[PDB]
Swiss-Prot record:
It is found in: Cytoplasm; Golgi apparatus membrane; Cytoplasm, Cytoskeleton, Microtubule organizing center, Centrosome; Nucleus, Nuclear pore complex. Residues 9-207 form the PARP catalytic domain. Belongs to the ARTD/PARP family. Ubiquitous; highest levels in testis. Oligomerizes and associates with TNKS2. Interacts with the cytoplasmic domain of LNPEP/Otase in SLC2A4/GLUT4-vesicles. Binds to the N-terminus of telomeric TERF1 via the ANK repeats. Found in a complex with POT1; TERF1 and TINF2. Interacts with AXIN1. Interacts with AXIN2. Interacts with BLZF1 and CASC3. Interacts with NUMA1. This is Poly [ADP-ribose] polymerase tankyrase-1. Poly-ADP-ribosyltransferase involved in various processes such as Wnt signaling pathway, telomere length and vesicle trafficking. Acts as an activator of the Wnt signaling pathway by mediating poly-ADP-ribosylation (PARsylation) of AXIN1 and AXIN2, 2 key components of the beta-catenin destruction complex: poly-ADP-ribosylated target proteins are recognized by RNF146, which mediates their ubiquitination and subsequent degradation. Also mediates PARsylation of BLZF1 and CASC3, followed by recruitment of RNF146 and subsequent ubiquitination. The lineage of its organism: Eukaryota, Metazoa, Chordata, Craniata, Vertebrata. It comes from Homo sapiens. Phosphorylated on serine residues by MAPK kinases upon insulin stimulation. Phosphorylated during mitosis. Ubiquitinated by RNF146 when auto-poly-ADP-ribosylated, leading to its degradation. Deubiquitinated by USP25; leading to stabilization. Zn(2+) binds at C131, H134, C139, C142.
Length: 208
């Protein structure tokens, strides 16, 4: 009924395909390391596959609808997502009703193709006050989690200066803003994203 969390063996080509994609999409943010911490590699502690029947079905029904609307192209893309509700999301799925009106591009769910970008969001906007135990945004101790999800983009609307919209523009199914820089993929329907992989990891202090 609920969600089954499956561990992936590090020697499974599937584990390797996800960690490789997480480690390789690390980038410099002209941050100084403030939001997500100072690092240039993660210690991937665990990769779990999130299996939930109802979520898959809601997600596949919507993906069909979007195909119909976009010349049989649902445009599925694997994307990272970071935020403080990861546990809630893996059990009940993505939910736009918990989406923040004020967001740069509206009340949607945000995704990035760069792992170092979603890591900045693990403990809230800008990385809030860091980890709960150490009030440190660059904690090398506490374990963090992020999601690598299948995101049904359908036809993406390229917006390029803020517009706080509540739904994708007419005829589109997603929004891509290029903030200052990097890209933000936004959806306004929980069922357009499926949280495929749950990743437990730590940022690692720079070597010396
Ligand atoms: C709500 O506004 C935010 C608060 C903190 C961060 Cl770090 C990012 C955002 N907006 C971007 C974004 O993508 N936020 C998502 C985060 C998960 C949220 N979420 C969900 O999809 N299912 C949920 C179930 C319970 C609580 C939150 C949930 C919806 C909005
Ligand atoms: Zn900590």
């Amino acid at each position: 009924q609920g969600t089954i969390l499956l561990d992936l063996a590090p020697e499974d080509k599937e584990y390797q395909s996800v960690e490789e994609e997480m480690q390789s999409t690390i980038r410099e943010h002209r941050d100084g390391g403030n939001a997500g911490g100072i690092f240039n590699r993660y210690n991937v502690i665990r990769i779990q596959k999130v299996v939930n029947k109802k979520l898959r079905e809601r997600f596949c029904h919507r993906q069909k609808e979007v195909s119909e609307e976009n010349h049989n192209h649902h445009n599925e893309r694997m994307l990272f997502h970071g935020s403080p509700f990861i546990n809630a999301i893996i059990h009940k799925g993505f939910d736009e009703r918990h989406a923040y009106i004020g967001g740069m591009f509206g009340a949607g769910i945000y995704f990035a193709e760069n792992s170092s970008k979603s890591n900045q969001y693990v403990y809230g906007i800008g990385g809030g006050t860091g980890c709960p135990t150490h009030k440190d945004r660059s904690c090398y101790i506490c374990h963090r989690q992020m999601l690598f999800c299948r995101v049904t983009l359908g036809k993406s609307f390229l917006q390029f200066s803020t517009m706080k919209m509540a739904h994708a523009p007419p005829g589109h199914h997603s929004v891509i803003g290029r903030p200052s820089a990097y890209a933000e993929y936004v959806i306004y329907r929980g069922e357009q994203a499926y949280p495929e992989y749950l990743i437990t990891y730590q940022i690692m202090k720079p070597e010396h």
